[PDB]
């Protein structure tokens, strides 16, 4: 209805995890049609990402702590998200 929305969310880790599972990436099978990118493919109920409440499944991750996630691999995104306790994630919905 509003088109692509740039949403922002600050999530704090718990038990070395952010509570979200990602899919996609450059060199990977696309999560959506002809769109490489890191997508929130799952949200663990009761986890940090769920308890914050801003992110939703299907969002393309655009940035994580000002690290551009556009044009990166799936393995690079996993390597980044598994570093710090605070995560400022910017997504497009």
């Amino acid at each position: 209805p509003l088109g692509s929305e740039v949403i922002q969310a600050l999530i704090f880790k718990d038990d070395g995890s952010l509570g979200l599972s990602i899919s996609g990436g450059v060199g990977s099978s696309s999560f959506k049609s002809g769109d490489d990118g890191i997508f929130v493919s799952k949200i663990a109920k009761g986890g940090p990402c769920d308890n914050e409440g801003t992110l939703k499944i299907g969002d393309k991750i655009l940035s994580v702590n000002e690290i551009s996630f556009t044009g990166i691999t799936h393995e690079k995104a996993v390597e980044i998200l598994k570093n710090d306790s605070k995560y400022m994630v910017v997504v497009e919905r």
Binding site: S17, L18, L20, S21, I22, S23, G27, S28, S29, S41, K42, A44, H74, A77, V78, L81, K82
Partner: peptide, 8 residues
């Protein structure tokens, strides 16, 4: 192409 879903 690989289609991975990684828990983070």
């Amino acid at each position: 192409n690989p289609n991975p879903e990684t828990s983070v």
